[PDB]
Design a protein around this ligand. Structure first.
Ligand SMILES: [Zn+2]
Ligand SMILES: [Zn+2]
Ligand SMILES: [Zn+2]
Ligand SMILES: [Zn+2]
Ligand SMILES: [Zn+2]
Ligand SMILES: [Zn+2]
Ligand SMILES: [Zn+2]
Ligand SMILES: [Zn+2]
Lengths: 288, 106, 285, 59
């Protein structure tokens, strides 16, 4: 019996609720006071992160000054001024002419200068108080990217001292980067997630599971690699150009034939049969 | 290719041979397929490097749902995603990978 | 802006949650049905209407998109039902009836641990459903978890193999932490006792890498408490009172950055709270 | 120049850093840089350094 004396342990049912969902949405419902409605409200004006900035930021490893200048320009466009100041400071503080020296006795490393590590620590503390994951990830990426017998002890200490990022806190920086990457993925932007994750010190683990091997075009043996271990020749040859394939490739699991990505794309743009004459409709047998 | 198709249609004895086989790196058993998980170890297919979706899961432009694989970097993913990524970048999108899989062939 | 959606249900709504991308919405009502809409560009398209429960539905929860499109619902019929979408159509894919009383709460584990579901019922037992592959599940029961019955369950954010921890709140006015041991057995870790009435909801704030753990608890008496731990070595929690509401407080939710708290209670009103610089919590609305 | 010659940072966010930079440059016998910075900045940093240290550096 519903609502009988046997249900003393069951709490009274809810009739109202509010919940954060997505990245910038609040979903709530209340008692009508015949069922009510559901309200979805955008609250992007409350979080310390911005979607537009996420869309506009770039991270080029090869050039740092260009990235800093463009990020400053975009931050100015959005309307954040402290971001402009911080990005300009990062532009100055990460120039190439301040490269550390191998010999500790030649000059004081720029990391020791108060406008280096201490300034970076102060900025990180301020933004940690503000809980701005985006800026933390960007800074911890940009500054890290620059890294790219008593004598031995002294040299090791010098190596440990010439970095603007304290090696004792690599874990915190990696956590910042991972959290920002997850936020980016939730936003729907995927390329930015990969770009950010390319700066993680800790590498991930390889896939443990199903793998693909290729029959050698010469000895027909099972070879795990682009070059045979017996015949020492190329094992995979394109089914269209009949050239050795070393990079990206595609193949039909049902027919076992494949080759160069662009070549097979061009072939299957108009045709629908396996280009080797096997008779397999590789599109219908592959696109699961 | 058209000539080969005609020859195969007329001559069945001239059928080509398979080029790629499936072998698990944990169970070590050759797998013939399609198949959802490893028949022996139940391990799943590799996931797309950009969408983190397992291979074989669904979702003209139907070609975009293929799996591009790079035997050099042993990484791969959805055709459309990987092509879009390589259109502007020149490295394997996986972290700590440096193979230029698309630019390698030329 | 604002988007308003018509449930079209036949009775009162009990819960509603969007997907991970913010593109679809799932609602539950006493009509023993679950509605799934599409809200792209502020639209109302009834994608699916699922009926598999024999009683009222309390809570629903979306799984991480990494594993596909998976929804879980807990009902008064002492049943938890899992719905999956295959080939563009939704269908029931599994069922669990290991409890003797109504199941009150469900929650998915963080995606790093895998695909794990945690349920909490009034019978006093907590069931963990682990996905084993090949469409099969494993069930682990922690029996006599609470004196009278459990009400709320919340996982903890993943940190560096791994350590699995969550928090449970029941009708004993106590909050209990649970940690997985190396063998696989689950053992109670710590107890928190500050409320005076039934504990109705607990929410463990997400992590951004800061060395601080935060949990929010709301109870029947109207007390809302923030439990903070500033050192994992001590594993000690210092509760603070946020505010005392005149009526029951039902649900508390965190923001993505864990800086804004949303509170919904029995007064048929919704409040937002932000922590001040001086360490106090102040309303926003 | 970036710090002084300009949803903002607190007005005196960088005072401690400037004071420590002055001390750092003066602690290694490079009084010239410290005195030049002190003269150029003027009143924006004058009140953060005790008079005795300023007189020592000037002399
Ligand atoms: Zn060979
Ligand atoms: Zn085929
Ligand atoms: Zn074929
Ligand atoms: Zn080719
Ligand atoms: Zn295997
Ligand atoms: Zn490669
Ligand atoms: Zn690679
Ligand atoms: Zn993909």
């Amino acid at each position: 019996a519903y609502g009988s004396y046997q249900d003393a342990n069951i709490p009274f049912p809810r009739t109202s609720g509010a919940r954060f969902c997505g990245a910038g949405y609040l979903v709530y419902f209340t008692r009508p006071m015949a069922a009510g409605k559901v309200i979805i409200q955008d609250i992007a004006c409350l979080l310390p992160v911005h979607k537009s900035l996420g869309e506009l930021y770039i991270l080029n490893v090869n050039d740092i000054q260009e990235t800093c200048q463009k990020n400053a320009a975009s931050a100015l466009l959005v309307g954040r001024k402290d971001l402009v100041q911080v990005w300009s400071l990062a532009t100055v503080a990460t120039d190439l002419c301040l490269g550390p020296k191998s010999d500790p006795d030649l000059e004081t490393p720029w990391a020791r200068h108060p406008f280096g590590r201490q300034l970076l620590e102060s900025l990180l503390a301020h933004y940690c108080r503000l809980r701005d994951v985006q800026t933390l990830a960007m800074l911890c990426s940009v500054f890290e990217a620059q890294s790219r017998d008593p004598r031995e002890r002294e040299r090791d200490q010098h190596d440990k001292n010439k970095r603007l990022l304290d090696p004792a806190n690599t874990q915190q920086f990696d956590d910042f980067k991972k959290c920002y990457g997850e936020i980016l993925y939730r936003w729907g932007l995927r390329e930015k997630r990969a770009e950010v994750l390319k700066f993680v010190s800790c590498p991930p683990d390889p896939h443990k599971g199903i793998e693909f091997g290729v029959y050698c075009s010469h000895c027909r043996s099972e070879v795990r690699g682009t070059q045979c271990a017996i015949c020492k020749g190329f094992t995979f040859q394109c089914a269209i150009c009949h050239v050795a394939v070393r990079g990206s490739s595609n193949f039909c699991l049902t027919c076992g034939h494949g080759g160069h990505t662009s070549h097979m794309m061009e072939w299957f743009r108009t045709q629908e049969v396996c280009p080797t004459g096997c008779g397999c409709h590789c599109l219908l047998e592959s696109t699961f | 290719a058209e000539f080969d198709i005609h020859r195969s249609k007329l001559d069945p004895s001239s059928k080509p041979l398979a080029q790629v086989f499936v072998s698990c790196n944990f169970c070590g058993k050759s797998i013939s397929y399609k198949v959802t998980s490893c028949p022996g170890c139940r391990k799943p297919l590799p996931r797309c490097a950009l969408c983190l979706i397992n291979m074989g899961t669904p979702v003209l432009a139907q070609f975009n749902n293929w799996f591009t694989w790079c035997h050099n970097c042993r990484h791969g993913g959805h055709a459309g995603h990987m092509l879009s990524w390589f259109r502007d970048h020149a490295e394997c999108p996986v972290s700590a990978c440096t193979c230029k899989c698309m630019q390698l062939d030329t | 802006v604002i988007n308003t959606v018509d449930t079209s249900h036949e009775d009162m709504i009990h819960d509603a949650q969007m997907d991970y991308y913010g593109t679809r919405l799932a609602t539950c009502s006493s009509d023993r049905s679950v509605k799934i809409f599409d809200v792209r560009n502020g639209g109302q398209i009834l994608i699916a209407d699922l009926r598999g429960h024999e009683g009222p539905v309390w809570q629903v929860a979306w799984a991480h998109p990494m594993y596909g499109n998976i929804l879980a619902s807990c009902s008064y019929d002492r049943k938890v039902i899992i719905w999956r979408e295959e080939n563009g159509t939704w269908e029931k894919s599994h069922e669990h009836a290991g409890h003797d009383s109504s199941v009150n709460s469900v929650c998915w584990a963080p995606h790093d641990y895998g695909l794990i579901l945690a349920c909490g019922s009034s019978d006093g037992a907590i069931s963990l459903l682990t996905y084993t592959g090949e469409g099969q599940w494993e069930v682990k029961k922690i029996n006599n978890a609470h004196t009278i019955g459990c009400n709320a369950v919340s996982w903890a954010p993943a940190v560096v193999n791994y350590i699995k921890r969550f928090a449970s709140g029941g009708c004993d006015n106590l909050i209990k932490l649970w940690k997985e041991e190396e063998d696989g057995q689950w053992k109670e870790e710590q107890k928190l006792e500050a409320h005076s009435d039934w504990v109705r909801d607990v929410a463990w704030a997400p992590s951004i890498g800061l060395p601080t753990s935060t949990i929010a608890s709301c109870s029947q008496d109207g007390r809302v408490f923030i439990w903070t731990c500033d050192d994992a070595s001590s594993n000690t929690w210092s509760p603070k009172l946020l505010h005392k509401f005149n009526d029951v407080v039902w649900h508390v939710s965190w923001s993505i950055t864990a800086n804004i708290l949303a509170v919904s209670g029995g007064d048929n009103k919704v409040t937002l709270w932000k922590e001040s610089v001086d360490g106090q919590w102040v309303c926003i609305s | 120049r970036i710090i002084y010659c300009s949803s903002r940072l607190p007005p005196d966010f960088f005072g401690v850093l400037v004071r420590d930079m002055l001390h750092f440059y003066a602690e290694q016998g490079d009084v010239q840089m410290a005195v030049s910075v002190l003269i150029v900045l003027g009143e924006r940093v004058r009140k953060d350094i005790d008079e005795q240290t300023q007189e020592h550096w000037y002399t």
